């Protein structure tokens, strides 16, 4: 996160750090708890990941330093990538991780609500992007979870900022015209959380952008409301 501040412990209890074990243990992406055995993240996080065996999901973490070999984690049973996904820039950048065990809900870990179909018309004015990603283009993964309040931008406005790309309605953008606050490397897969009627909703999944917090280059996110039926399809399978 560029231009953000340290989160308070338990502030984003749906936020997870997805670690890889191959070749060495490192943070790979962010993600969101959406169900007791379900993590919602970005499909691009899995480039070259040949097996769910190498993945470790850590919930209830504020600081990366809390993670040692003795730290409990959730194993991944299945990686479910949208079947239309080719690359982040073309959309369908959404994936589900089915966990091997159930997340026990509490004050350190709980799910975020998905947007409602009727809420495609609501205007979100209180949106926050979180993660352990870089604070500048060339940096390192941050210890403490960072947060930044970002205004949502219309698809028309986002399309002007991305000449040569096709900003679809399955994408949602967020940023300040002058830059300064944005998601950066290592934040991808994480949430874009919006509070409306005292309830937080998973509005976006950090996906892509041209650089980090640049003027007239808003962050591009998977528009979660457009995938509620695909999520229910995969999570509510008989
Ligand atoms: N302004 C809007 C934003 C939107 C989000 C974008 C983003 O985050 N893209 C991802 C794409 C990806 C590539 C490979 C794996 C997973 C995701 C990314 C992540 C990293 C990364 C990840 C883990 C790491 N661990 N240690 C590291 O140093 C480190 C660096 C580096 C480079 N790109 C940046 C622009």
Swiss-Prot record:
Glycans are attached at residues 63, 104. Changing residue 119 to G: In FA11D; mild phenotype. The active site is at residues 44, 93, 188. Heparin binds at residues 160-163. Residues 1-236 form the Peptidase S1 domain. Disulfide bonds join 29-45, 127-194, 158-173, 184-212. It comes from the Eukaryota. Changing residue 200 to S: In FA11D; mutant is not secreted by transfected fibroblasts; dominant-negative effect. This is Coagulation factor XIa light chain. The gene is F11. The chain holds residues 388 to 625 of 625 of the full protein.
């Amino acid at each position: 996160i560029v231009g953000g501040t340290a989160s308070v412990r338990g502030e984003w209890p749906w936020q997870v750090t997805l670690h890889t074990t191959s070749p060495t243990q490192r943070h790979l992406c962010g993600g969101s708890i959406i169900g007791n055995q379900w993590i919602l993240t970005a499909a691009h996080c899995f480039y070259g990941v040949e097996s769910p065996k190498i993945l470790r999901v850590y919930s209830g973490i504020l600081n990366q330093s809390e993670i040692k070999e003795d730290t409990s984690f959730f194993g991944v049973q299945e990686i479910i990538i949208h079947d239309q996904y080719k690359m982040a820039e073309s959309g369908y950048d959404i994936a589900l991780l089915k966990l091997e065990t159930t997340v026990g809900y509490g004050d350190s870990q709980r799910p975020i609500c998905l947007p409602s179909k009727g809420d495609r018309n609501v205007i979100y004015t209180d949106c926050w992007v979180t993660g352990w990603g870089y604070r500048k283009l060339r940096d390192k993964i941050q210890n403490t979870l960072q947060k930044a309040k970002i205004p949502l931008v219309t698809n028309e406005e986002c399309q002007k900022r991305y000449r040569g790309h096709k900003i679809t309605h399955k994408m949602i953008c967020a940023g300040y015209r002058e830059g300064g606050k944005d998601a950066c490397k290592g934040d991808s897969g994480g949430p874009l959380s919006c509070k409306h009627n005292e309830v937080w909703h998973l509005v976006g999944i950090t996906s892509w952008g041209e650089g980090c917090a640049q003027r007239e280059r808003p962050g591009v996110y998977t528009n979660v409301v457009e995938y509620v039926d695909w999520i229910l399809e995969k999570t509510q399978a008989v």
